[PDB]
Amino acid sequence: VNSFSGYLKLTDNVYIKNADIVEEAKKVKPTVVVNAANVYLKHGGGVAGALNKATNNAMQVESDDYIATNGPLKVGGSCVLSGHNLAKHCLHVVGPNVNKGEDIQLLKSAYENFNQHEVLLAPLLSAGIFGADPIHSLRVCVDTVRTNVYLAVFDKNLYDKLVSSFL
Numbered sequence: 772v773n774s775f776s777g778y779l780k781l782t783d784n785v786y787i788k789n790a791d792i793v794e795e796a797k798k799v800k801p802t803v804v805v806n807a808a809n810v811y812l813k814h815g816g817g818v819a820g821a822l823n824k825a826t827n828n829a830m831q832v833e834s835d836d837y838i839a840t841n842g843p844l845k846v847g848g849s850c851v852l853s854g855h856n857l858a859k860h861c862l863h864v865v866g867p868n869v870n871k872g873e874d875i876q877l878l879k880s881a882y883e884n885f886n887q888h889e890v891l892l893a894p895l896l897s898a899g900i901f902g903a904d905p906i907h908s909l910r911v912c913v914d915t916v917r918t919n920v921y922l923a924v925f926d927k928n929l930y931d932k933l934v935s936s937f938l
């Protein structure tokens with residue numbers, strides 16, 4: 772039993788809700804919140820910009836030190852950093868950005884990072900400003916993640932479409 776509330780159950784391990792991931796994280800304080808990161812951990816917009824704003828830029832400060840030490844992530848890769856005031860940990864995961872010409876096949880690799888964590892609050896990878904089809908992303912999530920994932924879909928209209936089309 773966990774403290775997530777109001778989710779629709781899609782499969783044994785995947786759950787979905789129309790919600791602002793920032794507000795969800797502040798309420799639940801999950802062990803792991805997933806950020807929709809880029810390889811430079813530059814948290815400008817979308818989920819990343821919103822999460823970073825909610826940390827008063829502490830996420831960005833920590834991320835800049837991480838990059839200065841380690842260099843950029845790989846597309847499809849991840850790193851674990853602090854969750855600041857939002858969660859215990861933040862798993863920064865880089866899905867492919869279609870608006871950069873990146874290979875959508877890397878979306879499965881990106882979701883594989885979730886399997887290293889028993890429970891996660893997460894967005895749909897590569898959706899929104901990353902330019903991929905959210906229906907496809909949800910399908911890849913369900914077919915790749917085996918741990919317990921609670922998906923927050925910000926757009927109510929998109930949420931309704933994902934549920935009604937879910938196979």
Ligand SMILES: OC[C@@H](Nc1ncnc2[nH]ccc12)C1CCC1
Binds near residue numbers: 792895897899925
């Ligand atoms: O990953 C892409 C998704 N982005 C977010 N998901 C959840 N909460 C969010 N808050 C700010 C952006 C954001 C889009 C699909 C509908 C939104």
Ligand SMILES: [Cl-]
Binds near residue numbers: 816817818898899
């Ligand atoms: Cl977005």
